[PDB]
Write a protein that binds this ligand. Structure first.
Ligand code: CDL
Ligand code: 3PE
Ligand code: 3PE
Ligand code: 3PE
Ligand code: 3PE
Ligand code: 3PE
Ligand code: LMT
Ligand code: LMT
Ligand code: LMT
Lengths: 97, 97, 115, 112, 51, 83, 140, 347, 171, 48, 174
């Protein structure tokens, strides 16, 4: 904050909601709990200038969990190829797929 | 990103252009403002629900509470504009040129 | 699915009834029959003219009160919290502030309709 | 410290002297404010409300003393950081091998 | 600096209050009867309503 | 106490609806403090198990942690059986 | 603008004038369009044609200035065998200022535009020769 | 407005600003902005005339639109980071939307059109709140997100604000429109140095607030809102004209006055980053601000315009306006250059 | 970025407890007491390993103890148990309170024949310790080494050398 | 399915970490019948 | 086809927005916003937010009811404008629908579409969570935490609503 009155007075007005790795009701975890915690622990105390560079792996994995962009691209690649092979009479799906 | 985001983001943009391109009725523009909150509410809810961040499930509710205040504030001004000129037309609000 | 099926059937039946109502009866349409109704004499002006709202201030206050319910509707779930000391204080706080806002508008004649 | 006007580590610095020239200037500024207050309200400028004039001076000096102490502390902090960083990174602050002007060459530009 | 686009500009009012509009707000006019349950069948009560 | 009675009786004659509201609102605020059962409400909310009770890795010095759910050690709900 | 600006600097000075002029003409037209958008938005034309006719003058005036600047600056260097000469942009800048004065019907603007646009362009040429930054990266 | 209601509303305006400044969560920052806008409109509408109604409506439409873009940036940040902490933003599209949202809230060019009109339409006391207190909350958010702000965007706004503020003031005869355009110009300096040294943004902000507060307080004292109405001050309160002169010269950045300090410090910071063309351009363009400050000193203090006969009746009555803090603010507005190194307290 | 290691289809095969949920619900309370030890070890494994692949073997011992549990009911209490879950199965919410009479018959059958006792209210929700020989995982998050902290700036605070050093100022 | 795709690697991870990641719906039911996917995704939400 | 339930609702969502963004008579703008609130509730419901979805629908139904009343008093003319009655309204309405259609066509034609930013058109189900067996609603526990965890949020929201009543009365007391 601009004025960190929360840290000074010890009150906790809104930090509880800031991250998804914080204590949740009945300990329900967020989907990307592990990825957040790793990134938060990697970058703790070293500052954004360093963290932008020395925690790219943790952040890049965390971003993948959040938006799943690499995964969906992989699935679209697999799905698209099956269409090509199914349509060419080349591959046939097994009963369970 | 997921395909739902495409239409929700498009919805926000449509209402944003809706608000910025005025016609005559000031009431019409106040609807484009409630339109922007509706899309912001929906898009926030999808992100929060999908990621299983429990504590922010209250965030969209708080968003609506301060949208109601803005709409009530906007309608109050429309009452006084109408009481002065006999319409809600925005071209009447040009004394300060 | 069931809910979508149920909604479609409801509004499908309603539309079918309207369709039947419009195409079964014999119609005889002419200008006087379809003219706007107003007790036998022609309307004096447009029904699209402005219609003053005397309860306008109550109507805006409804928007603010109508959002108190969204904040209060979670109360049955909140009653299951471990931290009941904080709950009850905050639940009572919201309702009192809602009561105070109502008292303020009441004492300042905000609920009286304008003449 | 976080959100603290004077963190505890600041007490290792010598406090501003009560006769600091910067503090005397602040006290003077309070005097001028006291005089302007008489002027705008149209009272005798030098004479009126000496009780009010003393409070203008006292309050300025009071606030100025703490501002000068924080000012001094923040400059001590800047030096403390700078010197330790130079200690922590010897390779980036190497001593210059200092030639003398007898050895160094400078091209001469006549002023004709 | 006068310009042709600002030739119609007047200085604002001294006390910031512009005159109220001369416009007359129009009240809705209604035929209440004759064909009306509360008109006794033959009263054409022409009312001017505000709301 | 006499001035208030006249006001109190006056409002019972003119605004009995508002007299009833403030009285009920007052009770809603006061009784939770003075009730001997209010403590049990939080205990019953505490005793409802929404989540799995994850076991502990026994290290050798956990005298009060039970080894089996039916062992005597651990919180008991006997107070609730009789509430 | 970033890519269009880069290609202008990509090609060597004094050579490939047709390409240089295409760059400055593109920079001229874009500037005219931006002025046209704000102009029509804030000063509404009476009719749709006059809104187009106003876009026509500003965009053409701006495109003409840039085309003449790029042409004159390139040709001047080509003739004089001095690519990295700041003076070449001085001539390009004045010619542009003259186009504005010619397009505007006013010897007062044409002269003033010559000087200010002439000095501005030479500073631009000085700027990239010496590496001057207008929006400098924070470094300390 | 009942006095108690005015105080509670006035405390709510401050509360929203304080919530923005102490919040570590983007939602609470947005709430603080909404709370502030809710409470300020009734102060704008206080006198209930068509002009005040127009100003409040134009203000509400502008601030509401900014809040939408601001909240949009927050939700985009949430998608690409999963967190709400107030700090750098993790998406460049979110950075642009927030930067523009804050630019409208400040009234920076080219989102400036509302500042001259809202200021002219409301009382002087309300205009003082609008041009001073309302700058704190948006600036404090910019002070925290600056590491992710696009440099070209922020500097483009600063340059445009300085130019548009400078040129806009030249044509004004109303004191409230002069203060609006002067405010737009000064906001440009604050954001221009923001990418390089945020401390000099705070210094410029504080000194701008002290000098703007002083000018509005002197306008309120004599109830003057036009250039000509102010030109009568010499014939009632000669002392006031001298304070207006010194404060106006300080606002123009003339040494050895306090107003020279923020301009002096900002030039130092920009040159340390090898930014030479921009501070030179900025300093010269600020001469436009000085020009229309000097006209006011000509008509106010250095000459004597004609009076009217009825002015003699005002000679018999004393000023009764509060003029709260005026003696202190004017001294701080003028005699602080010798204390410039005290700017390290803002560090 | 690696090829996810997935077990073979033979390493996943196991005898399945193929009974309905009303059957499991009917026997849940006794099942919780009888098969506590294998179950608790398996659940300790999952919340420690954080990996379903690292707990397969303990997950098979969960089924083998479940099948043995249901094999004892079949040997001694087949008929009383069969009435009871049938009563549970009828209910839309599989409520206990609608089958207390049949629950008794099954409850004294398992007490007389097998010696089983039903857990009390709150027993099955206790946190219990469990001894194991599986070593505690050391990097269950597969965390990389964290970056080093910024070297601490410490020492004795001294006055700024020649003060602010701002242009001409001597203090 | 991907045999004849050249750059492909079968069973590759999108994550730099080797830690186990819970699969999402598309990863688990990606290559299966629509009604099986539909029941897995919206079965609960749609159930009456 | 049913797997695309959320996408189909989002298409009607945008169409409702084009309904009121084109800005016909506020009578019809309110209708457009009611539709968008409806399918907007449907979208959020399909992500597991039954409470959040139903409430945005409920709040917006009351709000448009107030808007309808205010339209008849202060935003009505002799010939209220429908989408077909005005060239500017129709032009905006047509433009928004064509811009909506083409985005739909490409994303369905290819399973991905680029509209300024890359969007995957595999259907929205693919991102859903696989496992789930808690005996509660997660949205309900999160929303119910407003009273235990969100003490600070309740104070600021309660205050703002109280001030809102005070403010609207000041503004409307000419
Ligand atoms: C993601 C994708 C993006 C999402 C958005 C997609 C769009 C979806 C639709 C959204 C709703 C749009 C709402 C439009 C609206 O309300 O307009 C009201 C606005 C005022 O309506 P009005 O009060 O009835 O006045 C009618 C006359 O125009 C009154 O004017 P007049 O009587 O003076 O007639 C002369 C006229 C003649 O105008 C001219 O001078 C010609 C200028 C030509 C320039 C070349 O003067 C003008 O009106 C000047 C306006 C020129 C506009 C500035 C363009 C530069 O109408 C318009 O200006 C027409 C716009 C209609 C098409 C909108 C196209 C939407 C896309 C916008 C760009 C999006 C970029 C992103
Ligand atoms: C301002 C005085 C000059 C008046 C003419 C106005 C000139 C234009 C001002 C523009 C800014 C330039 C300021 C230049 C002065 C600051 C440079 C400086 O002197 O810094 C050092 C000063 C302490 O001075 P030092 O060398 O240590 O000698 C101590 C002797 N007792 O530490 C300081 O920073 C103190 C500076 C405040 C001024 C000197 C205070 C003297 C102590 C008595 C209080 C002042 C009362 C008289 C007020 C005079 C007002 C004209
Ligand atoms: C060491 C001081 C150096 C000063 C350097 C000045 C630097 C610039 C400072 C700017 C601030 C200036 C003060 C603010 C303006 C106040 C003065 C004013 O408004 O007008 C002049 C005023 C005379 O107006 P008048 O109505 O007659 O007031 C009655 C006074 N007898 O009031 C006056 O009479 C003139 C006031 C200025 C003179 C100050 C005198 C210093 C204090 C002397 C102590 C008192 C001595 C008493 C002597 C009598 C007993 C023997
Ligand atoms: C950056 C480096 C420079 C640092 C600069 C420091 C600036 C901050 C310092 C504070 C500046 C303001 C100083 C005000 C001095 C004048 C106060 C005074 O004399 O008041 C006289 C009288 C009221 O006095 P009284 O309220 O009884 O004092 C007790 C206060 N609780 O009533 C009166 O007639 C006074 C009327 C004139 C005052 C203007 C109106 C303001 C009212 C203020 C109320 C009292 C403030 C108490 C000041 C204490 C400050 C420690
Ligand atoms: C953020 C990045 C945005 C970059 C663009 C910044 C431009 C913002 C300028 C907006 C304020 C300009 C206001 C102004 O100067 O007046 C508007 C002007 C209308 O004047 P115009 O029609 O061109 O000339 C008539 C001659 N009788 O219209 C104009 O021609 C101004 C065009 C300025 C564009 C450069
Ligand atoms: C030391 C470090 C700091 C360095 C920075 C510079 C310090 C100076 C800052 C000044 C701050 C403002 C305070 C100035 C006090 C002025 C006092 C004064 O001039 O006398 C007031 C006089 C009142 O006239 P009278 O009617 O007799 O009395 C009524 C009031 N009781 O008024 C009049 O009658 C005059 C009317 C005619 C107007 C004449 C205008 C030209 C002369 C103005 C001189 C002051 C210039 C100030 C500008 C800044 C200069 C640096
Ligand atoms: C204008 C602003 C108006 C603000 C008005 C706010 C009114 C709030 C009144 C206090 C309401 C709660 O009051 C408080 O409730 C809790 C129960 O939840 C009680 O607490 C009691 O029960 C709880 C659990 O239920 C036990 O953990 C605790 O041991 C016991 O003390 C407190 O004894 C009582 O003092
Ligand atoms: C915590 C929830 C329960 C607490 C109750 C909260 C709501 C309190 C409502 C306000 C009560 C006091 O405020 C109210 O002000 C008006 C002034 O116009 C009073 O007086 C008015 O009321 C009645 C009915 O309108 C009129 O017949 C009377 O002529 C008028 O004077 C009311 O008698 C009083 O009830
Ligand atoms: C004023 C109108 C406002 C309308 C708002 C419309 C919605 C805006 C959507 C904002 C999010 C768009 O997100 C934008 O596109 C994709 C998102 O994966 C990113 O794509 C790019 O960045 C990331 C960075 O790691 C990488 O995938 C890669 O560099 C590249 O693909 C962009 O860096 C991002 O800026």
């Amino acid at each position: 904050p601009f004025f960190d009155v929360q840290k000074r007075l010890g009150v906790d007005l809104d930090r509880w909601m800031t991250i998804q790795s914080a204590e949740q009701p009945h300990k329900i975890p967020s989907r990307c709990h592990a990825f957040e915690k790793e990134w938060i622990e990697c970058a703790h105390g070293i500052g954004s200038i360093r963290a932008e560079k020395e925690c790219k792996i943790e952040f890049e994995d965390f971003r993948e969990c959040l938006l799943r962009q690499k995964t969906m691209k992989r699935l679209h690649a697999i799905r698209r190829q099956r269409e090509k092979l199914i349509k060419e009479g080349k591959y046939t799906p097994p009963p369970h797929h | 990103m997921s395909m739902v985001y495409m239409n929700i983001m498009m919805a926000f943009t449509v209402s944003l252009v809706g608000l910025l391109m005025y016609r005559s009725h000031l009431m019409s523009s106040l609807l484009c403002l409630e339109g922007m909150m509706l899309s912001l509410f929906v898009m926030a809810a999808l992100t929060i629900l999908n990621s299983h961040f429990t504590l922010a499930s209250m965030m969209p509710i708080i968003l609506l509470v301060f949208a109601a205040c803005e709409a009530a504030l906007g309608l109050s001004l429309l009452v006084m504009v109408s009481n002065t000129y006999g319409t809600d037309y925005v071209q009447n609000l040009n004394l300060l040129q | 699915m069931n809910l979508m099926l149920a909604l479609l059937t409801n509004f499908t039946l309603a539309t079918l009834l309207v369709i039947i109502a419009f195409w079964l009866p014999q119609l005889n349409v002419y200008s006087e029959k379809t003219s706007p109704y107003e007790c036998g004499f022609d309307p004096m002006g447009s029904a699209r003219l402005p219609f003053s709202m005397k309860f306008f201030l109550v109507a805006i206050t409804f928007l603010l009160f109508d959002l108190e319910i969204a904040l209060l509707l979670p109360l049955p779930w909140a009653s299951q919290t471990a931290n009941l000391n904080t709950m009850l204080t905050m639940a009572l706080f919201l309702i009192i502030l809602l009561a105070v806002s109502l008292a303020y508008e009441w004492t300042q004649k905000g609920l009286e309709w304008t003449e | 410290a976080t959100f603290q006007f004077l963190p505890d580590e600041a007490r290792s610095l010598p406090p501003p002297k009560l006769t600091d020239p910067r503090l005397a200037f602040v006290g003077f500024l309070g005097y001028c404010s006291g005089l302007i207050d008489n002027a705008i309200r149209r009272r005798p400028v030098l004479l009126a409300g000496l009780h009010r004039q003393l409070l203008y001076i006292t309050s300025f000096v009071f606030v100025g003393y703490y501002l000068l102490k924080r000012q001094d502390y923040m400059y001590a902090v800047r030096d403390h950081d700078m010197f330790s960083y130079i200690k922590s990174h010897p390779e980036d602050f190497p001593e210059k091998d200092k030639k003398t002007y007898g050895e160094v060459f400078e091209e001469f530009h006549p002023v004709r | 600096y006068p310009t042709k686009e600002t030739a119609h500009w007047k200085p604002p009012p001294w006390n910031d209050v512009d005159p109220p509009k001369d416009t007359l707000v129009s009240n809705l006019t209604l035929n209440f009867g004759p064909q009306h349950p509360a008109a006794h069948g033959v009263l054409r009560l022409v009312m001017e309503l505000s709301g | 106490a006499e001035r208030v009675a006249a006001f109190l009786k006056n409002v019972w004659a003119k605004e009995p609806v508002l007299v009833a509201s403030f009285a009920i609102a007052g009770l809603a605020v006061i009784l939770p403090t003075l009730s001997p059962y209010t403590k049990y409400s939080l205990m019953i909310n505490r005793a409802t198990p929404y989540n799995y009770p994850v076991p502990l890795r026994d290290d050798g010095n956990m005298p009060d942690v039970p080894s089996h759910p039916q062992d005597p050690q651990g919180p008991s709900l006997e107070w609730l059986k009789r509430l | 603008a970033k890519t269009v600006l880069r290609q202008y600097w990509d090609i060597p000075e004094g050579t490939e004038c047709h390409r240089k002029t295409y760059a400055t003409t593109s920079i001229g037209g874009a500037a005219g369009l931006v002025v046209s958008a704000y102009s029509v938005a804030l000063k509404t034309p009476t009719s749709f044609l006059e809104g187009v006719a106003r876009t026509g003058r500003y965009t053409f005036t701006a495109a003409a200035i840039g085309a003449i600047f790029g042409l004159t600056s390139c040709i001047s260097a080509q003739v004089r065998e001095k690519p990295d000469d700041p003076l070449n942009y001085l001539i390009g800048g004045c010619a542009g200022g003259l186009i504005l004065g010619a397009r505007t019907r006013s010897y007062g603007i044409g002269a003033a535009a010559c000087a200010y646009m002439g000095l501005t362009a030479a500073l631009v040429k000085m700027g990239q020769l010496e590496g001057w930054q207008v929006f400098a990266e924070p470094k300390v | 407005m009942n006095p108690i209601i005015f105080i509670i509303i006035l405390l709510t305006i401050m509360l929203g600003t304080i919530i923005v400044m102490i919040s570590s969560h983007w939602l609470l920052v947005w709430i603080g902005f909404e709370m502030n806008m809710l409470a300020i409109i009734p102060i704008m509408m206080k006198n209930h005339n068509p002009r005040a109604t127009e100003a409040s409506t134009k203000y509400f439409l502008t601030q509401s639109t900014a809040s939408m873009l601001l909240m949009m940036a927050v939700i985009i940040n949430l998608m690409f980071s999963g967190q709400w902490t107030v700090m750098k933003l993790f998406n460049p599209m979110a950075s642009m939307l927030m930067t523009m949202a804050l630019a409208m809230k400040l009234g920076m060019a080219p989102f400036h059109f509302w500042v001259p009109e809202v200021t002219q339409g409301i009382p002087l006391s309300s205009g003082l709140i609008l041009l001073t207190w309302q700058k704190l909350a948006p600036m404090s958010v910019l002070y925290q997100i600056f590491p992710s702000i696009n440099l070209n965007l922020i500097l483009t706004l600063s340059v445009l604000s300085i130019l548009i503020g400078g040129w806009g003031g030249l044509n004004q005869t109303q004191l409230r429109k002069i203060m609006a355009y002067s405010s737009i110009a000064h906001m440009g300096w604050m954001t221009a140095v923001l990418p390089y040294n945020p401390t000099m943004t705070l210094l410029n902000l504080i000194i701008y607030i002290i000098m703007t507060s002083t000018m509005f307080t002197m306008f309120m004292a004599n109830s003057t809102t036009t250039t000509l109405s102010l030109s009568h001050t010499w014939n009632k309160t000669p002392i006031m004209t001298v304070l207006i002169l010194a404060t106006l010269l300080s606002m123009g950045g003339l040494p050895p006055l306090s107003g020279f300090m923020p301009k002096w410090m900002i030039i130092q910071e920009m040159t340390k980053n090898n930014s030479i063309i921009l501070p030179t351009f900025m300093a010269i363009t600020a001469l436009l601000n000085l020009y229309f400050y000097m006209r006011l000193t000509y008509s106010t203090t250095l000459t004597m315009f004609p009076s009217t006969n009825n002015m003699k009746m005002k000679w018999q009555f004393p000023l009764m306006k509060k003029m709260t803090f005026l003696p202190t603010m004017v001294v701080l507005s003028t005699m602080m250059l010798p204390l410039t190194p005290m700017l390290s307290v803002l560090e | 970025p690696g090829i996810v290691e997935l077990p073979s289809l033979e390493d996943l095969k196991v005898q399945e407890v193929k009974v309905s949920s009303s059957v499991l619900k009917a026997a849940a309370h006794h099942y919780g007491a009888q098969c506590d030890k294998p179950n608790k070890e398996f659940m300790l494994c999952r919340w420690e390993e954080k990996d379903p692949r690292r707990c397969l073997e303990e997950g098979k011992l969960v089924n083998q103890c479940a099948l043995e549990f249901f094999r004892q009911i079949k040997r001694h209490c087949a008929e009383p148990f069969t009435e009871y879950w049938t009563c549970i199965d009828y209910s839309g919410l599989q409520l206990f309170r609608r089958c207390r009479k049949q629950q008794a018959q099954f409850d004294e059958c398992v007490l007389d024949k097998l010696g089983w006792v039903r857990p009390d209210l709150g027993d099955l929700s206790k946190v219990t310790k469990v001894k194991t020989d599986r070593p505690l995982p050391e990097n269950p998050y597969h965390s990389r080494a964290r970056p080093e902290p910024n070297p601490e700036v410490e020492g004795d605070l001294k006055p700024a050398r020649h003060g602010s050093r701002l242009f001409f100022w001597t203090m | 399915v991907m045999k004849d795709v050249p750059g492909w690697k079968v069973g590759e991870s999108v994550f730099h970490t080797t830690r186990w990641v819970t699969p999402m719906m598309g990863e688990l039911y990606g290559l299966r019948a629509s009604e099986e996917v539909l029941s897995a995704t919206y079965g609960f939400i749609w159930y009456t | 086809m049913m797997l695309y339930i959320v996408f189909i609702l989002s298409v009607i969502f945008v169409m409702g927005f084009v309904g009121f963004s084109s800005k016909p008579s506020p009578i019809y703008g309110g209708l457009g916003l009611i539709v968008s609130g409806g399918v907007g509730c449907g979208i959020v419901l399909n992500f597991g937010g039954s409470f959040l979805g139903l409430m945005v629908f409920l709040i917006y139904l009351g709000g448009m009811m107030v808007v309808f009343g205010y339209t008849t008093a202060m935003a009505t003319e002799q010939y209220p404008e429908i989408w077909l009655s005005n060239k500017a309204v129709l032009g905006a309405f047509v433009t928004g629908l064509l811009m909506e259609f083409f985005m739909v066509y490409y994303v369905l034609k290819d399973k991905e579409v680029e509209v300024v930013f890359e969007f995957n058109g595999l259907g929205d189900w693919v991102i859903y969570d696989t496992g789930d067996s808690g005996f509660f609603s997660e949205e309900a526990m999160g929303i119910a935490a407003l009273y235990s965890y969100g003490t600070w949020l309740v104070i600021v929201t309660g205050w703002s609503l109280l001030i809102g009543v005070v403010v609207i009365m000041e503004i409307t007391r000419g």
